[PDB]
Amino acid sequence: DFINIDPLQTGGKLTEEARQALLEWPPIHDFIHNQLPKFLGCDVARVTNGAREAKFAVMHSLAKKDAWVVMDENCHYSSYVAAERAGLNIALVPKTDYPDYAITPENFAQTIEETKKRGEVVLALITYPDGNYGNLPDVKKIAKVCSEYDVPLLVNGAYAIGRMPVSLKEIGADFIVGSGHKSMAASGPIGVMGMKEEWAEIVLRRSEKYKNKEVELLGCTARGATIITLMASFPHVRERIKRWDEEVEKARRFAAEMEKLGIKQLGDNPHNHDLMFFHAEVLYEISKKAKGGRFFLYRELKSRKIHGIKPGLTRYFKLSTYGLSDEEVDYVLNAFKEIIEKYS
Amino acid sequence: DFINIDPLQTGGKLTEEARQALLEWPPIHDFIHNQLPKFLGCDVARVTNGAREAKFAVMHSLAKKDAWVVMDENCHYSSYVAAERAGLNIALVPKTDYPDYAITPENFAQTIEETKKRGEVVLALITYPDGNYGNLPDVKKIAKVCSEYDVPLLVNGAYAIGRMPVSLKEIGADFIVGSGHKSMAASGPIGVMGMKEEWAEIVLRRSEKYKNKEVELLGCTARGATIITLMASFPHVRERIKRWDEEVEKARRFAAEMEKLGIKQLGDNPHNHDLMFFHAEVLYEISKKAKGGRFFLYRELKSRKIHGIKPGLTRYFKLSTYGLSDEEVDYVLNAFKEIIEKYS
Numbered sequence: 296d297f298i299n300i301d302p303l304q305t306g307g308k309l310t311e312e313a314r315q316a317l318l319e320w321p322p323i324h325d326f327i328h329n330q331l332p333k334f335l336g337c338d339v340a341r342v343t344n345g346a347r348e349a350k351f352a353v354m355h356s357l358a359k360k361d362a363w364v365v366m367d368e369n370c371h372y373s374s375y376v377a378a379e380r381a382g383l384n385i386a387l388v389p390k391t392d393y394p395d396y397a398i399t400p401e402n403f404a405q406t407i408e409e410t411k412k413r414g415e416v417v418l419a420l421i422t423y424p425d426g427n428y429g430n431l432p433d434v435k436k437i438a439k440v441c442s443e444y445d446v447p448l449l450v451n452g453a454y455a456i457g458r459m460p461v462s463l464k465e466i467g468a469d470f471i472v473g474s475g476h477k478s479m480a481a482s483g484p485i486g487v488m489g490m491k492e493e494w495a496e497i498v499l500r501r502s503e504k505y506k507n508k509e510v511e512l513l514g515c516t517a518r519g520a521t522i523i524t525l526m527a528s529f530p531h532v533r534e535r536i537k538r539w540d541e542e543v544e545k546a547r548r549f550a551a552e553m554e555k556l557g558i559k560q561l562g563d564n565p566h567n568h569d570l571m572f573f574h575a576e577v578l579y580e581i582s583k584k585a586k587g588g589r590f591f592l593y594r595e596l597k598s599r600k601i602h603g604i605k606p607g608l609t610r611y612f613k614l615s616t617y618g619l620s621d622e623e624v625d626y627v628l629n630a631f632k633e634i635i636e637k638y639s
Numbered sequence: 640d641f642i643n644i645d646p647l648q649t650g651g652k653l654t655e656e657a658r659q660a661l662l663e664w665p666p667i668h669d670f671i672h673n674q675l676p677k678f679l680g681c682d683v684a685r686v687t688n689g690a691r692e693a694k695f696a697v698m699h700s701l702a703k704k705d706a707w708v709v710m711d712e713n714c715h716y717s718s719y720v721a722a723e724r725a726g727l728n729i730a731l732v733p734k735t736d737y738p739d740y741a742i743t744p745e746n747f748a749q750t751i752e753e754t755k756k757r758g759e760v761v762l763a764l765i766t767y768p769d770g771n772y773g774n775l776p777d778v779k780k781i782a783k784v785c786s787e788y789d790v791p792l793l794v795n796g797a798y799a800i801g802r803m804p805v806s807l808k809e810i811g812a813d814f815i816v817g818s819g820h821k822s823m824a825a826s827g828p829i830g831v832m833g834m835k836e837e838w839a840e841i842v843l844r845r846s847e848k849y850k851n852k853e854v855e856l857l858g859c860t861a862r863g864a865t866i867i868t869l870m871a872s873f874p875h876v877r878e879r880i881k882r883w884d885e886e887v888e889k890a891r892r893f894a895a896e897m898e899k900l901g902i903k904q905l906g907d908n909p910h911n912h913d914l915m916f917f918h919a920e921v922l923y924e925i926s927k928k929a930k931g932g933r934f935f936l937y938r939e940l941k942s943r944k945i946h947g948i949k950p951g952l953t954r955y956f957k958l959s960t961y962g963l964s965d966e967e968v969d970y971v972l973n974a975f976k977e978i979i980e981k982y983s
C-alpha cells in the first residue's frame with residue numbers, strides 16, 4: 296500500500312469498473328461518435344494509440360515542405376519529437392524566468408510573428424498544462440492570438456483532460472489532445488483527439504482503395520484492453536472532473552505547507568494543478584552528508600509507504616496530489632517535516 | 640466455451656502466464672536487446688504499437704518525393720494504407736488466378752522492374768503469409784529478387800511470427816514485422832519490428848534535442864499491459880513454434896476433410912498454414928432457402944459452441960485450425976457434415 300505521488304500516475308489510476316472490465320476480457324460507435332466529442336466539447340473526436348500518436352497525426356496531416364510549427368518552450372518532449380518526425384521546422388515560444396516559467400500569450404504572438412517571417416507556420420501548439428511545472432497558460436487568449444494569425448492551434452491537454460473540465464469550443468483552438476493512461480484512468484498506449492469538423496476531410500481522410508479506413512490512423516479500430524478500460528472508466532472520469540476545485544485547493548494547501556517546510560513550489564502561484572514542481576535546497580544539502588546521499592530521499596520515503604519521485608532527485612522534483620485524500624496529503628507533508636528534522 | 644476458429648484470434652489466444660501477469664498489473668532491456676532480436680533472427684529489433692505501426696515506421700523512414708513501393712496484391716490493407724500515409728506511389732505485384740492466388744517471385748521481379756521504369760522504388764514488401772488465403776510466397780527467392788535489384792525488402796510476418804519458426808537472416812530480406820495480438824498471444828495494439836543494423840541509424844534515428852529518444856517511434860518506452868502480456872507469453876511462444884509441423888498437418892487434414900464435404904480450400908495446396916480460405920457453393924445454395932438465409936450458417940454454429948466466421952458469409956470464408964485440438968478439429972468437421980445433411 297504505497298501512497299503514490301508520481302504525476303504520470305495519479306491521474307491514470309485504473310478504475311475499479313475498468314479493472315473488472317479487464318478481467319472478463321460495445322457502444323464503441325456511440326462512444327467516439329457521441330459521448331467523446333461531447334465530453335471534449337468539439338465536433339469530431341477519435342481514439343488514437345496515445346497522445347503523441349495523435350499529436351503526430353495532425354502534424355503529419357498539415358505539414359508542408361519547409362513549413363514551421365510553434366510550440367511552447369515547456370512542450371512535452373513528444374510534442375517536439377513528433378514535430379521532427381513530421382519534418383517540421385520547430386520554433387519554441389520562450390518561457391518566463393524563475394520562478395514563473397510561464398508561457399505568456401504575448402511571447403506567443405511574437406514567436407508566431409517572428410517565425411512567419413521565416414516561412415509558413417502550418418501549426419501552433421500549447422501544452423495545457425505543461426508536465427513540467429504544472430503551469431496552465433492562457434489558451435483562451437493564446438487561442439485568440441493564433442486565430443488572428445490564421446495558424447491552427449493544437450492543445451496538448453495531456454494533463455488537463457480527465458482531470459479538469461475543458462472544452463475545445465470553449466477555448467477556441469482548432470485541435471485538442473488527451474492521454475488516457477495518465478489523465479483518463481485507462482491502460483496501455485491510448486489517446487483522444489478532438490477537432491473542428493473542418494479539419495476532418497483533412498486529418499480523417501480515407502484511403503483511395505479502402506474508402507472506409509482513415510489513412511491518418513491506419514484504418515485502426517483499436518479494439519483492445521485499451522479502449523475497453525478507457526470506456527469502462529469514462530463514466531467515472533465524467534464525474535471526476537467535477538471535484539477539480541477541491542483538487543486545486545488541496546494541491547494548493549500541500550504547496551504552501553511545503554513552503555513553510557523550506558521547500559518551494561515554482562510556477563503558477565497560486566498554483567492551478569495537482570502537479571507541482573519544487574525547489575528544496577535543504578534536501579540538497581542534506582544529500583551531501585545523508586546516508587545514501589543523492590538517494591537518501593527515495594530511501595526515506597520508500598520506507599514510509601511512499602513513492603512517486605524519480606529516485607536520486609533531492610534538489611528539484613515534481614509531484615501530484617491528485618488521488619491523495621486530505622489525510623494522505625497531511626501524512627505526506629508530515630513525512631517531509633520528519634526527514635527534515637531527522638538530518639540535523 | 641466457444642471453439643474459436645477466427646483467424647484473427649487463434650494465434651492471439653492470451654497466455655495463462657500473461658493472463659495472470661495482467662492481474663498483478665523488468666528485463667525490458669534484456670528482452671528487446673537480446674531475446675527479441677535473437678528470436679526474429681536479426682540484428683536490431685524494437686517493439687512498436689502494432690504491425691501496421693511498424694510497417695509505417697520504415698515506409699515513412701525511407702520514403703522520397705515521388706518514390707515508389709512494391710507490395711503483393713495480397714497485401715493486408717494496412718500495408719497499403721500505411722503506404723498512402725507515407726505518400727508513396729504503390730505498385731501491386733499481381734497474384735495467380737483461382738485457385739492459386741499465388742505471389743510468384745517472377746511477377747515480383749517484373750513488377751519491380753516495370754516500376755523502376757516509372758521511378759525509384761524505395762521499398763518492397765511481401766505479406767508472408769497473406770491474411771487472405773494463408774499463402775506463403777517464396778520469400779527466400781523473392782528476397783533474392785529484391786537483393787539483385789537493390790530495393791529493401793520488408794516482410795509482413797504478421798501471420799508467421801509467433802506461429803511458424805522464422806529468421807530474417809535466414810530469409811535474406813532487410814526488414815521484418817510481427818503482430819503480438821494475433822500471432823504472439825499478446826494484448827492491446829502491439830508489434831515487433833526487426834532489421835539489419837545498417838538500417839538503424841536510418842529508422843532508429845534519434846531526435847536532435849532528445850539524443851536518447853528515437854524519432855521514428857516518438858521516444859516511446861511503450862510500458863503498459865501491452866508489453867507486459869507480450870513478454871509474459873513470450874516463453875510460451877518460444878516453444879510454441881516447435882509444433883508448427885503438427886499445426887500444418889492438422890490444418891491440412893481439416894482441409895481435405897472439408898474437401899470431401901463439398902467445400903474447397905483455395906491457395907497453397909497442400910496448404911501451409913492454419914489459416915485457410917474456403918469455397919462452399921453448397922452452403923451458398925442452402926442460404927437461399929435456409930432459415931435465416933445468408934445467416935443460417937452463423938446461426939447453426941453459434942448454436943454448436945462454435946464461432947469465428949464473419950456472420951453472413953456462406954459462399955466464401957476463412958478459418959484457423961491453430962489452437963484446435965484434433966478432437967476440436969473433428970468436432971468442427973462433423974459440425975459441417977451435419978448442417979449439410981440437415982438442409983436437404
Ligand SMILES: *Cc1c(COP(=O)(O)O)cnc(C)c1O
Nearest residue numbers: 345346347348371426453474486
Ligand atoms: C505523457 C505526456 C504525453 C504523451 O502521452 P502519450 O499518450 O504516451 O503519447 C504528452 N504530453 C504530455 C504533457 C505528457 O505528460
Ligand SMILES: *Cc1c(COP(=O)(O)O)cnc(C)c1O
Nearest residue numbers: 689690691692715770797818830
Ligand atoms: C492484422 C494484420 C496486420 C495488422 O496488425 P496490427 O498489429 O493491428 O497493425 C498486418 N498484416 C496482416 C497480414 C494482418 O493480418
